[PDB]
């Protein structure tokens, strides 16, 4: 070190009270204490439905303290560097994303942001479309969550008198967790109230579906179902478990 201690000083400390520098009590020199090299280990993998091959990201080390690739997030071992740039598949950090491709292995690459496209601009050139398309996208939003309720006495001291008497000493910790989980469970009936129940009446379709040639029978309700739900609503109720 270059930490010049004073001749009465023994220990050098950190912010967090751990000792950062000591003085050697036989040959009076000053020694730093850096803790030994550490870092998080992240295991980049595709699904085990696909393969059992992984590639290990040693977070925030160099490739000395351990095919072997270096990122700005750490030393990535097990993934092959590829000059090509694809869309991001398994995000690593600092621009690198990994994926499982083809003889198959795990590759790592600088990800691509999109195809480069120079617009043919000039000061008198306009590009007016001659034809269109009607695209129906899908936007999927959460509205409510599961209305739970936790009995704060039966959870902690379940069917015990000798424990429930000790719980009364803590006061109203029980009767405010039942209030906080009620204040959630009330507005979960208000979120579904505000989203759907905006129409004041219940309209219903005429029996003859001559809507200009369009075909709404895939989104209108089906009377043959026991719960009168549409065809696309039945696809959504079977893709969520």
């Amino acid at each position: 070190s270059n930490k010049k201690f004073l001749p009465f000083q023994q220990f050098g400390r950190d912010i967090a009270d751990t000792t950062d520098a000591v003085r050697d009590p036989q040959t009076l020199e000053i020694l730093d204490i850096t803790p030994c090299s550490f870092g998080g280990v992240s295991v980049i993998t595709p699904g085990t439905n696909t393969s059992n091959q992984v590639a290990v990201l040693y977070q925030d080390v160099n490739c000395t303290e351990v095919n072997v690739f270096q990122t700005r997030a750490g030393c990535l071992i097990g993934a092959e560097h590829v000059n090509n740039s694809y869309e991001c598949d398994i995000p690593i950090g600092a621009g690198i994303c990994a994926s499982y491709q083809t003889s198959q292995s795990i590759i790592a690459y600088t990800m691509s942001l999109g195809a480069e496209n120079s617009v043919a601009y000039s000061n008198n050139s306009i590009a007016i479309p001659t034809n269109f398309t009607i695209s129906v996208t899908t936007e999927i939003l959460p509205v409510s969550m599961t209305k739970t309720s936790v009995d704060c006495t039966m959870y902690i001291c379940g069917d015990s008198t000798e424990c429930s008497n000790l719980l009364l000493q803590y006061g109203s910790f029980c009767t405010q967790l039942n209030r906080a989980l009620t204040g959630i469970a009330v507005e979960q009936d208000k979120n579904t109230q505000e989203v759907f129940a905006q129409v004041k009446q219940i309209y219903k379709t005429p029996p003859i579906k001559d809507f200009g040639g369009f075909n709404f029978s895939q989104i209108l309700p089906d009377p043959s179902k026991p719960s009168k739900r549409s065809f696309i609503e039945d696809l959504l109720f079977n893709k969520v478990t």
Binding site: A127, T146, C163, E233, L235
Partner: protein, 250 residues
């Protein structure tokens, strides 16, 4: 409903002659676009990722809460009925006060996870309640608030703890380059378009609307006069037809 979409095309600056002259085309581009939603739903299970995550993050936080009951928290046994049957009430109240201190901290951790997570759903329900009012019950001029493209209408569908919209958007497809010009000298006056822009296929000039190539002869019913030629940068020369002139010519 053929006259509703002509309002909806007027909301995006497309003149409603595009609708009625292409009604059988839009009926087959709308019905075939609903038919691709099902094949995008009946095969790809990862389409509902925002709603399956709401179910997963709550079955995770309950099954973490239940597994906290199997922890000792410093006490000799996680079973409360095994401390009461194996210890004396002066000593047992030391062991039980470690479990109550440990389990009550595990509820306050759980409820604080639920208050923050239910403040995320309420911010995602008020976004859904805004997209229900502004995008189903009307037509939105807010770009990319209702699906990528010029928006026409939406259709809501219910979903397990959530809502699913079907934003029906208008997207322009097939383009052509055109030599344009912001203005036209006719007699020294500078005719500017009322609605649309001036284009040229190369030989003759036409005024057309912005979002669909529909060329028209440049008349004084399409253009309005302002000023003279000496100011506008990029003005071109043309004749501008007058509808009144061959009436009084005969």
């Amino acid at each position: 409903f053929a006259m509703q979409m002509a309002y909806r095309f007027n909301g995006i600056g497309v003149t409603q002659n595009v609708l009625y002259e292409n009604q059988k085309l839009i009926a087959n581009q709308f019905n075939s676009a609903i038919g691709k939603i099902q094949d995008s739903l009946s095969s790809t299970a990862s389409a509902l990722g925002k709603l399956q995550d709401v179910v997963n993050q709550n079955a995770q936080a309950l099954n973490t809460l239940v597994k906290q009951l199997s922890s000792n928290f410093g006490a000799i046994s996680s079973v409360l009925n095994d401390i009461l049957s194996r210890l004396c009430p002066p000593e047992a109240e030391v062991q039980i006060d470690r479990l109550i201190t440990g389990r009550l901290q595990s509820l306050q951790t759980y409820v604080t996870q639920q208050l923050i997570r239910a403040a995320e759903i309420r911010a995602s329900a008020n976004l859904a309640a805004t997209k229900m009012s502004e995008c189903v019950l009307g037509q939105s001029k807010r770009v990319d608030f209702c699906g990528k493209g010029y928006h026409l209408m939406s259709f809501p569908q219910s979903a397990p703890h959530g809502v699913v919209f079907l934003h029906v958007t208008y997207v322009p497809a097939q383009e052509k380059n055109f030599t344009t010009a912001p203005a036209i000298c006719h007699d020294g006056k500078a005719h500017f378009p009322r609605e649309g822009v001036f284009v040229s296929n190369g030989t003759h000039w036409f005024v057309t609307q912005r979002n669909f190539y529909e060329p028209q002869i440049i008349t004084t019913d399409n253009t309005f006069v302002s000023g003279n030629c000496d100011v506008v940068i990029g003005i071109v020369n043309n004749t501008v037809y007058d509808p009144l002139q061959p009436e009084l010519d005969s």
